[PDB]
């Protein structure tokens, strides 16, 4: 079968920065009959379906900014964004539509860079309804911060507690290319009333001392 | 205009089989050949085959004959892919794709012998900007819609993928707005898990 081989795996962008990426097939997609070369270009924002954004290798689809440029004929294909925009991070893979099976490429992951953001730091103790249960979960948020490396120190009456703790993060937001985190401790009712004070630190760039969060059941 | 509609996911327990569904619109069923992709979280798209449903003609990918089987209803312009004898590799979003270019909402096939179970929505309030909280938690499988105030509080919402252990899934969402009016104007997470069938609108009230 034909092999898609595409590069780099991933790239991370300032907003207006020329973005090239490659797309090498094993075998020329160049048709002798019409001479177009069978090669696509496809789009797939974080939870979305693929959408198609150039064909025969460098005719964009209808409604696609023109700054989504493409190129190569061959073997060797290139798709081009002139200048990067936050909206446009994404997945971007190619696939050849020159013999079966249909072989896609693996995807280059395209996020953006920007300034320094501090995250917004909000602690939630176990709700009534949940303790009624048994249950006692404590979230932590931490919204809208840059750059994404960050780290959440759990403490329980002034010990750190490591053990229990799941985070979650958001895709990088397509406006203002922060990301958001949250973090839950999770508990038992009995556990949770054989402590005091719950605290949670997030230690960030944008700071050398950590945020602190706490509060006192 | 062009829609391939595809159920939003799929329980199938291991060596089950399962009939995958694309109902196409806005163009006409047999005048395209319909394409099928199946994509991991792993590694890169798979191009599992294609059927022309004006004649039922199939090109499969070698490596899907025996697993997936290609089959349409011109009655009802739908297109459906047979996955037989599903093991954990089976696990994947499958998509539809009118030639190749409009692909279908794509369908989320879980394999796992783990029973549906519907979640617990608890509401997360605060101990010149207000941040509140909607904790689903326990439920499988995936997904579950959440809204806050039916959808009409978009701006300043942040929901998080769900965390998965033992078969359950954990899932949370903050809305932040200005201090000043919460809680005179209520906030509410609309929560909806389809497969136990499920709908909870949890207000967010002061402590």
């Known amino acids: 079968d034909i092999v898609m081989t595409q590069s780099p795996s991933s790239l991370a962008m300032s907003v207006g920065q020329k973005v090239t990426m490659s797309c090498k097939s094993s075998?020329?997609?160049?048709?002798?009959?019409?001479?177009?070369?069978?090669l696509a270009w496809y789009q797939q924002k974080p939870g979305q379906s693929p959408k198609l954004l150039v064909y025969?290798?460098?005719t964009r689809e209808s409604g696609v900014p023109d700054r989504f440029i493409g190129s190569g004929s061959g073997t060797d294909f290139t798709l081009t964004i002139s200048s990067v925009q936050a909206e446009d991070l994404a997945d971007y893979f190619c696939?050849?539509?020159?013999?079966?099976?249909?072989?896609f490429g693996s995807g280059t992951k395209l996020e953006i860079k920007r300034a320094d953001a501090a995250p917004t730091v909000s602690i939630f103790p176990p709700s009534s309804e949940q303790l009624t249960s048994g249950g006692a979960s404590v979230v932590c948020f931490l919204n809208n911060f840059y750059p994404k490396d960050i780290n959440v120190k759990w403490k329980i009456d002034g010990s750190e507690r490591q053990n229990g703790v799941l985070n979650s993060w958001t895709d990088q937001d397509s406006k203002d290319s922060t990301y958001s985190m949250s973090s839950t401790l999770t508990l038992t009712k009995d556990e949770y009333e054989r402590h005091n004070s719950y605290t949670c630190e997030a230690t960030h760039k944008t700071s050398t001392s950590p945020i602190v969060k706490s509060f006192n059941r | 205009q062009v829609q391939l509609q595809q159920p939003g996911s799929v329980l199938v327990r291991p060596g089950a089989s399962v009939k995958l569904s694309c109902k196409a619109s806005?163009?006409?069923?047999?005048?395209?050949?319909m394409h099928w992709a199946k994509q991991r979280p792993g590694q890169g798209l798979e191009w599992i085959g294609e059927?022309?449903?004006?004649?039922?003609?199939?090109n499969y990918n070698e490596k899907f004959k025996g697993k997936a089987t290609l089959t349409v209803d011109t009655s009802s312009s739908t297109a459906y892919v047979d996955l037989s004898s599903l093991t954990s590799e089976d696990s994947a979003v499958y998509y539809c794709?009118?030639?190749?270019?409009?692909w279908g909402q794509g369908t989320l096939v879980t394999v796992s012998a783990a029973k549906t179970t519907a979640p617990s929505v608890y509401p997360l309030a605060p101990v010149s900007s207000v941040t509140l909280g909607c904790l689903v938690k326990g439920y499988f499988p995936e997904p579950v819609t959440l809204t806050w105030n039916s959808g009409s509080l978009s701006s300043g919402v942040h929901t998080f993928p769900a965390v998965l252990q033992s078969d359950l899934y954990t899932l949370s969402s903050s809305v932040t707005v200005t201090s000043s009016t919460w809680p005179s104007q209520s906030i509410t997470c609309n929560v909806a898990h389809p497969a136990s069938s499920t709908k909870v609108d949890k207000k967010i009230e002061p402590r």
């Open positions: 025969f290798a460098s």
């Open positions: 794709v009118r030639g190749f270019a409009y």
């Open positions: 696939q050849q539509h020159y013999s079966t099976p249909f072989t």
């Open positions: 059927i022309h449903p004006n004649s039922g003609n199939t």
């Open positions: 806005g163009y006409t069923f047999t005048s395209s050949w």
């Open positions: 075998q020329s997609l160049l048709n002798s009959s019409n001479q177009k070369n069978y």
